[PDB]
């Protein structure tokens, strides 16, 4: 009943402290040793770095300030960082340090080597229902956490979910996340996951995440998404039709839960009803889920992945990123 209610009061207090005085320049570039490139983002390279004194490894995203200006992403970049430095939940990736210099912004991210659920679902084909359920449980709780903070996630999809070295889920990207009470209108996200009210530009709220959960659950258990096609536009068309076919092996409870998540009518969608998340949590498809044990990372994972161990002399855009 009320153990939940105080956990969330304390979570909000923690979030708001950090959200009202965000932390700045918490480290410096000369503290990290470059190892190699991990990849590329939009504004620059992602580097595997090693903290020179603690020995811990991080994914440091480098962001060219001028390229951020040029791609029209100042506000989104400020906001992403502000959200990341403020949150804290066992299935969310950490922003471990941030800092800036003349040329760049740096986001030193927690680095768990692994491989996305994207690559895993594709090469395994599909997950059994308890396997899907175990991941889904982690997203339910994660959304319950983000939503209590008025944060809409807005980018749920297999590619943003890493399967960690304990086989637990980690949400790895906060690119589209937005803090809003009430409603907002930005068309963003990967087409297969979008709620029809996003596509129709009628404004929408945190309930799109719950539609997107329903999409994810269906994909994990079917091996393919419920709404699909060659072109984004056809995908959008199929969603607005709202004609979901379930595989023959989907249990009754799964189909039941799925009709309530992929539910067009907001007065009926599981998630934002007067009962909120408990409507999902008490749902029959999750009767076997130990919520508390899930949060504590105690449930035995159904699969553990294969182990691994891997600037200008002028100041640029000082005013634009002063809040960074």
Swiss-Prot record:
Annotated phenotype, changing residue 109 to L: Enhanced basal kinase activity
SMART domains reported for this sequence: S_TK_X, S_TKc
Gene Ontology CC entries for this record: acrosomal vesicle; calcium channel complex; cAMP-dependent protein kinase complex; centrosome; ciliary base; cytoplasm; cytosol; extracellular exosome
GO biological process: adenylate cyclase-activating G protein-coupled receptor signaling pathway; adenylate cyclase-inhibiting G protein-coupled receptor signaling pathway; cAMP/PKA signal transduction; cell communication by electrical coupling involved in cardiac conduction; cellular response to cold; cellular response to epinephrine stimulus; cellular response to glucagon stimulus; cellular response to glucose stimulus
Known outcome of mutating residue 183 to A: No phosphorylation
Positions with a binding annotation for ATP: 38-46, 61, 110-116, 157-160
Membrane-protein topology: Lipid-anchor
Active site (record annotation): 155
Sample GO molecular function, one term: manganese ion binding
Activity regulation comment: Allosterically activated by various compounds, including ATP. Activated by cAMP; the nucleotide acts as a dynamic and allosteric activator by coupling the two lobes of apo PKA, enhancing the enzyme dynamics synchronously and priming it for catalysis.
InterPro entries cross-referenced by the UniProt entry: AGC-kinase_C, Kinase-like_dom_sf, Prot_kinase_dom, Protein_kinase_ATP_BS, Ser/Thr_kinase_AS, STKc_PKA
Coiled-coil zones: none
Phosphoserine modifications at: 128, 312
PTM text: Autophosphorylated. Phosphorylation is enhanced by vitamin K(2). Phosphorylated on threonine and serine residues. Phosphorylation on Thr-186 is required for full activity.
Phosphothreonine found at: 37, 184, 186
Effect annotated for changing residue 125 to R: In CAFD1; decreased interaction with regulatory subunit PRKAR2B
Gene3D superfamilies: Phosphorylase Kinase, domain 1, Transferase(Phosphotransferase) domain 1
Disease: Primary pigmented nodular adrenocortical disease 4: A rare bilateral adrenal defect causing ACTH-independent Cushing syndrome. Macroscopic appearance of the adrenals is characteristic with small pigmented micronodules observed in the cortex. Adrenal glands show overall normal size and weight, and multiple small yellow-to-dark brown nodules surrounded by a cortex with a uniform appearance. Cardioacrofacial dysplasia 1: An autosomal dominant disease characterized by dysmorphic facial features, congenital cardiac defects, primarily common atrium or atrioventricular septal defect, and limb anomalies, including short limbs, brachydactyly and postaxial polydactyly.
Family: Belongs to the protein kinase superfamily. AGC Ser/Thr protein kinase family. cAMP subfamily.
Subunit relationships: A number of inactive tetrameric holoenzymes are produced by the combination of homo- or heterodimers of the different regulatory subunits associated with two catalytic subunits. cAMP causes the dissociation of the inactive holoenzyme into a dimer of regulatory subunits bound to four cAMP and two free monomeric catalytic subunits. The cAMP-dependent protein kinase catalytic subunit binds PJA2. Both isoforms 1 and 2 forms activate cAMP-sensitive PKAI and PKAII holoenzymes by interacting with regulatory subunit (R) of PKA, PRKAR1A/PKR1 and PRKAR2A/PKR2, respectively.
Its job: Phosphorylates a large number of substrates in the cytoplasm and the nucleus. Phosphorylates CDC25B, ABL1, NFKB1, CLDN3, PSMC5/RPT6, PJA2, RYR2, RORA, SOX9 and VASP. Regulates the abundance of compartmentalized pools of its regulatory subunits through phosphorylation of PJA2 which binds and ubiquitinates these subunits, leading to their subsequent proteolysis. RORA is activated by phosphorylation. Required for glucose-mediated adipogenic differentiation increase and osteogenic differentiation inhibition from osteoblasts. Involved in chondrogenesis by mediating phosphorylation of SOX9.
Name of the protein in question: cAMP-dependent protein kinase catalytic subunit alpha
This protein's encoding gene: PRKACA
């Amino acid at each position: 009943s009320s153990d939940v209610k105080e956990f969330l009061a304390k979570a909000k207090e923690d979030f708001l402290k950090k959200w009202e005085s965000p932390a700045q320049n918490t480290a410096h570039l000369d503290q990290f040793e470059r190892i190699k490139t991990l990849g590329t983002g939009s504004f620059g390279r992602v580097m595997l770095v090693k903290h020179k004194e603690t020995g811990n490894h991080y994914a440091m995203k480098i962001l060219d300030k001028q390229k951020v200006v040029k791609l029209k992403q100042i506000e989104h970049t400020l906001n992403e960082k502000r959200i990341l430095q403020a949150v804290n939940f066992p299935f969310l990736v950490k922003l471990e340090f941030s800092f800036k210099d003349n040329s760049n912004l740096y986001m030193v991210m927690e680095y768990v080597p692994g491989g996305e659920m994207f690559s895993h679902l594709r090469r395994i084909g599909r997950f059994s229902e308890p396997h899907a359920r175990f991941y889904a449980a982690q997203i339910v709780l994660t959304f319950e956490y983000l939503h209590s903070l008025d944060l809409i996630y807005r980018d749920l999809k297999p590619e943003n979910l890493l399967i960690d070295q304990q086989g637990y889920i980690q949400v790895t990207d906060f690119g589209f996340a937005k803090r809003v009470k009430g409603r907002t209108w930005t068309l963003c996200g990967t087409p297969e996951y979008l709620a029809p009210e996003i596509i129709l530009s009628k404004g929408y709220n945190k309930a799109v995440d719950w539609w997107a959960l329903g999409v994810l659950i269906y994909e994990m258990a079917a091996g393919y998404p419920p709404f699909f096609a060659d072109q984004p536009i056809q995908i959008y068309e199929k969603i607005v039709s709202g004609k979901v076919r379930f595989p023959s092996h989907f249990s009754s409870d799964l189909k039941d839960l799925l009709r309530n998540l992929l539910q067009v009518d907001l007065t009926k969608r599981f998630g934002n009803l007067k009962n909120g998340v408990n409507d999902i949590k008490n749902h029959k498809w999750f009767a076997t889920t130990d919520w508390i044990a899930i949060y504590q990372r105690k449930v035995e994972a159904p699969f553990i992945p294969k182990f691994k161990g891997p600037v200008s002399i002028n100041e640029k855009c000082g005013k634009e990123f002063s809040e960074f």
